[PDB]
Design a binder for this molecule. Structure first.
Ligand code: TA1
Ligand code: GTP
Ligand code: GDP
Ligand code: ADP
Ligand code: MG
Lengths: 428, 361, 441
């Protein structure tokens, strides 16, 4: 069987993963004691994609946590679903990075990545056939970028043939929650695009717009944003855990959605999202979802697709539905909005279906899309970055931990070349 | 401000071991055009290249000996190297096609390299005056599973050791290798020693093809520095000139699938073929970059390209030659080369859309 | 004896085979547990035939088939459904990992370590068979397993066994619809080898069955289960001559004889009589003439390929149920009178005929109806050129930019194994253009 590890780094990852497990456990019917209390045998035919087994019919996740400095270690442990995690896997250190990519890549992370990779190996070699790895880290910050990219660069050396799938929170355009976002994000993208197969670029302003406009929520906290990102995380693997009429897996997405290797920066999405009152007036069918997926606002990535072209699209579905309706609607989209798709590929959409839906819904979906619009993000940084580099604003903190300007220029000229590789195909 | 490619080929003659078995010829030529007809007589593929070296029979006109290959391919690289431009030459052919007789040669019939180098030193000793000076450094490194290694270094008195050589992008001078040796050379008797010290440490292995099959790309750089500029109000050079020559040997596009390869030999044919694909993409991008079409040139997908962003592209001049065999037992081995070098299509059915008309006041 | 082997590959293969073996177990009065109360009551007859279901001593019955996917989620649904007790437990879940919708994995880097068990099982099933043989591979183009494993198995079965019939009842890709984007490359690479090592490959197109389902049976929201039952009925119409009795029987060798003129033009099309729903089962006679006219009526073809833009080179017609041959002859002559159905000059004979007295069956949970007669047509036409060239163009648009290759060179496929196949299909696009030319002195 196919199996996944879940590395979980930073103040976003160590908060996302708790929500992700508090979501999958509800799918596989696990309680925070690790025991099972479900109702369907399908939950345990293929539970081993994520969970291992303990002695007394308990189940424990293959979660690794890397920089749980006690403010977050305790926050997970003093929580509902914190008891199940393996304590030897709660790795941590002290004297954190402090919003510094270097302190999380060169100096402190180098002292701890050995201890982390030991847990990675000890968990992997228990698996029968590894399919890939995951990660959920923040960019612009220090540790989620540094330690995450370090672990990636070392894992892909040890385990090159396998998948590595980093679900990252990229910086926001307008409201920056950190003034060293561009340096760290650039230096991380310099190490992600080379040493990664697919990564899904989430952004927070788009999720805030999604939660304020579509769900009509007046008090959106971070846990409600993670509550979405987790749904996507689960919708990506429903084809791997549960059965359907046309299965799929992460390798299929990484094959069909990555025509060229460097163009593996994606825009995810998830249907149907609606308010608690406005669920009485919405018909739950396929075309409603398909409309709510290709909309510019369900985009979690903060990039209007209509400004560019979708090189490739993948749609995972969950529920007892048809295959003709799916194909018909996707063909209608390929034929109506022809300009928003590419010409040198005649079909730019694929499908995957699971015949077992989410616990409280009848039929959901998950969207992945590679576009030329995402370059906007890496254009913004390449305007934010260089202005800081000319007058060398936040530079001394990054030289003082063993770096140089040269590396930064490498990262800049690996971002801008990729922006050009995107912009090659959006004119005509 | 254009470029060229100048793809070419070379059809060897039968070896005696293959001439006594009465092996059937499968490669004919019509001047510029080349063709490949099976022994079964159901299909005939016909290709067209900018150059065609027909080395089958000494009686045929248009006989392309070693010196012909020199004067046709290598001397313009020599010229542009003097004119302050960087040059890059490639040699391709699967095992048995005799790349070595085309590049290096024999001690009675030379190849390209030594003719090129001796014309270099003769032109130097001709132009060598008190004002001008010429300084030459060299290097000979490889690529193996996308990792960089140096063949020129004498290996440490050690076990099996993979080297820490990694790439770095200077913002101006371009990409380079961190820690690569650069030895100086004056006469060819030294460069021969350096190359023969290099090749022995190369990555090779045995297969169904032969015991001697290369499994790592080779790059051989010659950096030439001209020092002529001298200031009149004082002894100072306003500028120097530097030209980078890069002669390159490629690995054969193994079909791992038909060789029942498994393990470390399967992790090479996957890297080799990747580098060849990126190289073909890059050259097919350059050939369009000569025709005014603005496109992207992915020098980043492969190290063999990333180290050559400056040489392959710009005010430079690439070059290629591809060795094939005319025997009817190496047909699928051969045609791939003929289909890998399909970068001589520059005026083949281009469309047309022009809007500028009668511009006036 | 008269026996066949049925192989299935991939999710498409298993999802066809489940319907097929459901139908077979329904026809012979078999229950899902291999047993027969019908023979226990009757006390005679070969009803659970030795052609598909072999026989142990306890009255049980065991299929002459296996299936492999490299994708356990399908077979493990057979090992937990209604039909877990029927099959031999050797359904090859070697699915420690999928074949990534690519041909390189299925043909070499994930087909290694799996195929040998399949050859062992095929030998074990062949040695149980004392006579006639023939393999029915149910696979799929575009997909990686259904392409790679099919190629790697057929090139080995042309080696070990050789002079037997091998028939591929595969799913062609639709030109507009498709559930993938790497479909054409894998399709072409499969064709490159299955033009040699196979003997006749019947094709279908899921868009065609979608149109057939909405237009005739009045089904707006189908599923693949509603299609695979039509396909099982196709196969049953093929095989009724071998299992059951009838006037004119057509053995597997005759299909590959009469419909394959030249060795490279063995890619025909198929159809049935699904103008037949339960409400419209009334209001219609369903004679032989009407169905023989319908089988050539476009929008009922199971491959979207307008034949009027091309020509027919051969046809076979296999009838079930109550048929009197003079009706068959009147029907065939009614087609030969028409001019919108062009034939080649060199096949004036045109048609093969097969008749079987057993009618079809009716799966409970079915969209079709009970009929006293039913038809299956299998035609070889030049029009499928238009069905190839589309996949020949999409390829040429994409391969020019060398997209989607790095995943395939990642698993041993060369850059130059593509053009070696594209030119093969260029030849096959010519050997459908020379066959449709009328001879001249
Ligand atoms: C009466 C009723 O149907 O309640 C629904 C509900 O009202 C709606 C609005 C639910 C509700 O979702 C939210 O309230 C919400 C809040 C913040 C951020 C995101 C969602 C619901 O909370 C969410 C919850 O959905 C699920 O439970 C899914 O299984 C989801 N899992 C969880 O939400 C979950 C969260 C914590 C712990 C355990 C499970 C899921 C689905 C697929 C993959 C991963 C997770 C459901 C059915 C509902 C409520 C409960 C109201 C919706 O949920 C989702 C993610 O699709 C919001 O839009 C759908 C449509 C549902 O109608
Ligand atoms: N007719 C029919 N076709 C199906 C069915 N299920 C899947 N397919 C076809 O299968 C194709 C998708 O690839 P598959 O053949 O399933 O490949 P696979 O079985 O998943 O094996 P891999 O390629 O290794 O993943 C599509 O073109 C579908 O048309 C089915 O139930 N009936
Ligand atoms: N979606 C989400 N983002 C978060 C959360 N917590 C922090 N972040 C983001 O993470 C970034 C800060 O990164 P941080 O983890 O503090 O840096 P690090 O400690 O060095 O890894 C900010 O831009 C936040 O938007 C969370 O709970 N949810
Ligand atoms: N133009 C030529 N005339 C005569 N012999 C040639 C010619 N080109 C190649 N050969 C023969 O080919 C042989 C070299 O093949 P080899 O170098 O082993 O293949 P590879 O270059 O792939 O290693 C030489 O021994 C040489 O005799
Ligand atoms: Mg599959």
């Amino acid at each position: 069987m196919r199996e996944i590890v879940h590395i979980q780094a930073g103040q976003c990852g160590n908060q996302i993963g708790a929500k992700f497990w508090e979501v999958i456990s509800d799918e596989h019917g696990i309680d925070p004691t690790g025991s099972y209390h479900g109702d369907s045998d399908l939950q345990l035919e293929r539970i081993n994609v994520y969970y291992n087994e303990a002695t007394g019919n308990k189940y424990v996740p293959r979660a690794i946590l890397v920089d749980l400095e006690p403010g977050t270690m305790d926050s997970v442990r003093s929580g509902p679903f914190g008891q199940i995690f393996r304590p030897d896997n709660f790795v941590f250190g002290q004297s954190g990075a402090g919003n510094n990519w270097a302190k999380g890549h060169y100096t402190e992370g180098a002292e701890l990545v050995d201890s982390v990779l030991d847990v990675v190996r000890k968990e992997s070699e228990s698996c029968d056939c590894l399919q890939g790895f995951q990660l959920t880290h923040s960019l612009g910050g220090g540790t989620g970028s540094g330690m995450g990219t370090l672990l990636i660069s070392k894992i892909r050396e040890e385990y090159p043939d396998r998948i590595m799938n980093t679900f990252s929170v990229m910086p926001s355009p307008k409201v920056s929650d950190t003034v060293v976002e561009p340096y760290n994000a650039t230096l991380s993208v310099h190490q992600l695009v080379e040493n990664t197969d697919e990564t899904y670029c989430i952004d927070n302003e788009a999720l805030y717009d999604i939660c304020f406009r579509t769900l009509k929520l007046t008090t959106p906290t971070y846990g409600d944003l993670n509550h979405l990102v987790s749904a996507t995380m689960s919708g990506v693997t429903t084809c791997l855990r549960f059965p359907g009429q046309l299965n799929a897996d992460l390798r299929k997405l990484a094959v069909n959605m990555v025509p060229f290797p460097r163009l593996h920066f994606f825009m995810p999405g998830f249907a149907p999202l609606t308010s608690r009152g406005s669920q009485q007036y919405r018909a739950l069918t396929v075309p409603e979802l398909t409309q709510q997926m290709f909309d510019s606002k369900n985009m979690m990535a903060a990039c209007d697709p209509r400004h560019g072209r979708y090189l490739t699209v993948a749609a995972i579905f969950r529920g007892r539905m048809s295959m003709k309706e799916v194909d018909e609607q996707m063909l209608n989209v390929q034929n109506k909005n022809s300009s928003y798709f590419v010409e040198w590929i005649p079909n730019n959409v694929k499908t995957a279906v699971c015949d077992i839906p989410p616990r409280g819904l009848k039929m959901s979906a998950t969207f992945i899309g590679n576009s030329t619009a995402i370059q906007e993000l890496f254009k913004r940084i390449s305007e934010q970055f260089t202005a800081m580099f000319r007058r060398k604003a936040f530079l001394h903190w990054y030289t003082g931990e063993g770096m140089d300007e040269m590396e930064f220029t490498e990262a800049e000229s690996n971002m801008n070349d990729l922006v050009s590789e995107y912009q090659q195909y959006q004119d005509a | 401000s254009n470029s060229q490619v100048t793809v070419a080929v070379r059809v060897r003659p039968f070896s005696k071991r293959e001439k006594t078995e009465k092996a059937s010829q499968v490669v004919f030529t019509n001047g510029e055009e080349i063709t490949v007809e099976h022994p079964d007589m159901k299909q005939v593929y016909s290709f067209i290249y900018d150059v065609s070296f027909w080395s089958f029979d000494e009686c045929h006109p248009g006989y392309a000996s070693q010196t012909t290959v020199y004067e046709t391919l290598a001397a313009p690289l020599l010229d542009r190297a003097f004119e302050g431009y960087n040059t890059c030459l490639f040699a391709y052919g699967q095992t048995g096609s005799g790349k070595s007789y085309t590049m290096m040669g024999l001690n009675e019939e030379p190849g390209i390299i030594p003719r090129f180098c001796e014309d270099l030193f003769a032109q130097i000793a001709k132009k060598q005056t008190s004002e001008v000076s010429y300084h030459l450094e060299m290097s000979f490194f490889e690529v193996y599973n996308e990792k960089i290694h140096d063949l020129l270094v004498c290996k440490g008195e050690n076990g099996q050791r993979k080297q820490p050589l990694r790439a770095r992008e200077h913002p101006v001078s371009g990409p380079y290798v961190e820690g690569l040796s650069m030895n100086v050379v004056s006469s060819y008797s030294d460069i021969q020693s350096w190359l023969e010290l290099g090749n022995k440490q190369r990555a090779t292995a045995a297969t169904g093809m032969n015991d001697k099959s290369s499994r790592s790309h080779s790059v051989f750089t010659l950096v030439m520095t001209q020092t002529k500029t001298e200031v009149v109000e004082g002894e100072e050079h306003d500028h120097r000139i530097t030209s980078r020559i890069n002669l390159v040997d490629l690995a054969g596009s193994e079909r791992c699938s038909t060789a029942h390869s498994s393990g470390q030999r399967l992790k090479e044919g996957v890297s080799i073929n990747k580098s060849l694909l990126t190289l073909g993409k890059v050259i097919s991008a350059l050939s369009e970059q000569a025709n005014g079409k603005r496109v992207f040139i992915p020098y980043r997908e492969s190290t063999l390209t990333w180290l050559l962003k400056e040489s392959l592209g710009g005010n430079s001049k690439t070059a290629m030659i591809a060795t094939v065999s005319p025997a009817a037992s190496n047909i699928e081995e051969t045609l791939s080369t003929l289909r890998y070098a399909t970068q001589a299509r520059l005026i083949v059915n281009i469309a047309k859309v022009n809007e500028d008309m009668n511009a006036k006041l | 004896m008269r026996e066949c082997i049925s192989i299935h590959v991939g999710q498409a293969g298993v999802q066809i085979g489940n319907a097929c073996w459901e139908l077979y177990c329904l026809e012979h009065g078999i229950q899902p547990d291999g047993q027969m109360p019908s023979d226990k009551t009757i006390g005679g007859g070969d009803d659970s035939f030795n052609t598909f279901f072999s026989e142990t001593g306890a009255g049980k019955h065991v299929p002459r088939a296996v299936f492999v996917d490299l994708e356990p989620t399908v077979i493990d649904e057979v090992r937990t459904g209604t039909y877990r007790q029927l099959f031999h437990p050797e359904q090859l879940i070697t699915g420690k990992e999928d074949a990534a919708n690519n041909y390189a994995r299925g043909h070499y880097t994930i087909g290694k370590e799996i195929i040998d068990l399949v050859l062992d099982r095929i030998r074990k099933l062949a040695d149980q068979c004392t006579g006639l043989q023939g393999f029915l591979v149910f696979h799929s183009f575009g997909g990686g397993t259904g392409s790679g494993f099919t190629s790697l198995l057929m090139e080995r079965l042309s080696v070990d066994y050789g002079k037997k019939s091998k028939l591929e009842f595969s799913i062609y890709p639709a030109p507009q619809v498709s559930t993938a984007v790497v479909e054409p490359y894998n399709s072409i690479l499969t064709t490159h080898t299955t033009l040699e090592h196979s003997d006749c490959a019947f094709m279908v197109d899921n868009e065609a069955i979608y149109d057939i389902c909405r237009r005739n049976l009045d089904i707006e929201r189908p599923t693949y289960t509603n299609l695979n039952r039509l396909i099982s009925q196709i196969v049953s119409s093929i095989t009724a001559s071998l299992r059951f009795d009838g006037a004119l029987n057509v053995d597997l060798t005759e299909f590959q004889t009469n419909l394959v003129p030249y060795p490279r033009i063995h890619f025909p099309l198929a159809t049935y009589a699904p103008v037949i729903s339960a409400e419209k089962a009334y209001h219609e006679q369903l004679s032989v003439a009407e169905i023989t006219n319908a089988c050539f009526e476009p929008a009922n073809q199971m491959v979207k390929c307008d034949p009027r833009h091309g020509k027919y080179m051969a046809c076979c017609l296999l009838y079930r149920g109550d048929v009197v041959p003079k009706d068959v002859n009147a029907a065939i002559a009614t087609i030969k009178t028409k001019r919108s159905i062009q034939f080649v000059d060199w096949c004036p004979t045109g048609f093969k005929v097969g008749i079987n007295y057993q009618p079809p069956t009716v799966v409970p949970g079915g969209d079709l109806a009970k009929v006293q007669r039913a038809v299956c047509m299998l035609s070889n036409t030049t029009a499928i050129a238009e069905a190839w060239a589309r996949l020949d163009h999409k390829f040429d648009l994409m391969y020019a930019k060398r997209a989607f290759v790095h995943w395939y060179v990642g698993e041993g496929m060369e850059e130059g194994e593509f053009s070696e196949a594209r030119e093969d299909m260029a030849a096959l696009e010519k050997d459908y253009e020379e066959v449709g030319v009328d001879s001249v002195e």
